[PDB]
Amino acid sequence: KVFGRCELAAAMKRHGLDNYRGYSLGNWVCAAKFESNFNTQATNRNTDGSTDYGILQINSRWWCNDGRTPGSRNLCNIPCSALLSSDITASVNCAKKIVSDGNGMNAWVAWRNRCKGTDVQAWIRGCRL
Numbered sequence: 718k719v720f721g722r723c724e725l726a727a728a729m730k731r732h733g734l735d736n737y738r739g740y741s742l743g744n745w746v747c748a749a750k751f752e753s754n755f756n757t758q759a760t761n762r763n764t765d766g767s768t769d770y771g772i773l774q775i776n777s778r779w780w781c782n783d784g785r786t787p788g789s790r791n792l793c794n795i796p797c798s799a800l801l802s803s804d805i806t807a808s809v810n811c812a813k814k815i816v817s818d819g820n821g822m823n824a825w826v827a828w829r830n831r832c833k834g835t836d837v838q839a840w841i842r843g844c845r846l
């Protein structure tokens with residue numbers, strides 16, 4: 718499923734992502750735009766041999782199990798396949814685990830380079846929320 722910008726914002730808010738850990742909703746929409754262009758089925762290999770999955774391009778070295786990444790931790794306790802569903806629940810729950818501690822949304826390079834330090838509230842312009 719390729720979500721619309723506001724469509725995704727609304728689905729995220731139905732899972733309480735708005736202001737999760739202090740990150741306003743636009744941060745997550747901005748991250749999803751530049752990670753996956755809003756496509757839940759996006760998959761992309763990395764130079765370390767891990768792969769990123771789903772609308773937030775969550776990695777298989779640390780977060781999900783894809784059965785082919787040496788030394789994977791699966792800290793979200795989920796098959797990476799689950800992050801490709803049209804239902805964003807699994808991606809949201811894993812994103813919440815990622816942001817629960819550590820470097821927060823800095824786990825996403827795209828967030829750090831494209832979203833951090835900008836007015837991310839622009840990303841929910843014109844969205845009924």
Ligand SMILES: O=C1C(Br)=CC(=C(c2cc(Br)c(O)c(Br)c2)c2ccccc2S(=O)(=O)O)C=C1Br
Nearest residue numbers: 759760761762763764765766767768769770774
């Ligand atoms: O900085 C990088 C970046 Br950027 C990409 C890549 C590669 C690559 C190729 C494909 Br195809 C692919 O799907 C992905 Br992901 C990466 C690559 C290129 C030539 C030979 C072997 C690889 S290898 O590393 O894949 O063996 C290597 C370095 Br170094």
Ligand SMILES: O=C1C(Br)=CC(=C(c2cc(Br)c(O)c(Br)c2)c2ccccc2S(=O)(=O)O)C=C1Br
Nearest residue numbers: 760761762763764765766767768769785786787
């Ligand atoms: O030195 C190389 C060079 Br150059 C290319 C490639 C690859 C590759 C090659 C072709 Br051709 C291609 O069409 C695609 Br896509 C990827 C490759 C890259 C990453 C992962 C798997 C492959 S794999 O496909 O080789 O398993 C690996 C090495 Br090592």
Ligand code: NA
Nearest residue numbers: 782783786789
């Ligand atoms: Na894995």
